[PDB]
Amino acid sequence: DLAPALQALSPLLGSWAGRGAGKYPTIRPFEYLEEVVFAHVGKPFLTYTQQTRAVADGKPLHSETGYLRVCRPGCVELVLAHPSGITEIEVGTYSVTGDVIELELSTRADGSIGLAPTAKEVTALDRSYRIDGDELSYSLQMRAVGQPLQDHLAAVLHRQR
Numbered sequence: 455d456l457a458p459a460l461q462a463l464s465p466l467l468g469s470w471a472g473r474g475a476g477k478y479p480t481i482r483p484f485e486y487l488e489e490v491v492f493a494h495v496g497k498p499f500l501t502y503t504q505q506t507r508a509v510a511d512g513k514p515l516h517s518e519t520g521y522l523r524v525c526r527p528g529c530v531e532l533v534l535a536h537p538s539g540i541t542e543i544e545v546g547t548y549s550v551t552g553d554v555i556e557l558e559l560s561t562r563a564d565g566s567i568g569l570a571p572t573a574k575e576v577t578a579l580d581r582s583y584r585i586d587g588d589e590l591s592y593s594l595q596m597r598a599v600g601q602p603l604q605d606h607l608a609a610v611l612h613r614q615r
């Protein structure tokens with residue numbers, strides 16, 4: 455059974471696939487393909503995994519894995535591990551407007567970043583997610599490696615059968 459706390463976020467459940475792009479002042483721009491799965495085990499959190507790969511040659515780029523907790527309806531904690539040696543807790547809120555869910559999260563809202571000894575220096579991450587029917591879109595802003603908070607990613611995914 456779905457935990458009551460997750461009712462508003464039930465449209466996230468399932469498999470999502472699509473494409474996005476990214477940039478940062480210290481790197482060259484890039485694009486990627488993305489696969490996401492949201493699932494649950496009957497508690498007040500979703501499980502979440504992401505895999506991305508290069509559009510050109512399908513080489514694995516970034517992945518992330520963890521949990522989207524509901525901290526009472528309307529509140530979210532996104533808890534993630536990254537294979538780059540970084541952990542992330544983003545905190546925020548969401549709203550339901552018919553078939554549209556808007557989630558706004560940030561490490562800067564009493565969240566966390568952890569850096570392994572060999573990780574790049576990331577100090578903030580902000581995420582804006584929109585689920586509109588069978589479309590999931592997002593942007594991610596990053597403060598890292600001497601640069602102010604600014605876009606690093608954005609993508610559009612579609613619900614898979």
Ligand code: HEM
Pocket residue numbers: 476478480481482484486488506515516536540542574575576579596598599606607
């Ligand atoms: C869809 C997800 C993502 C993709 C496809 C992606 C892709 C890239 C690519 C291709 C680069 C440049 C090449 C490289 O350094 O490997 C890069 C750089 C970077 N990314 Fe990401 N990234 C993603 C998510 C993230 C996230 C979530 C973080 C932070 C936790 C992050 C932090 C960085 C940093 C710090 C740089 C290095 C900048 C530098 O050396 O100056 N990325 N990313």
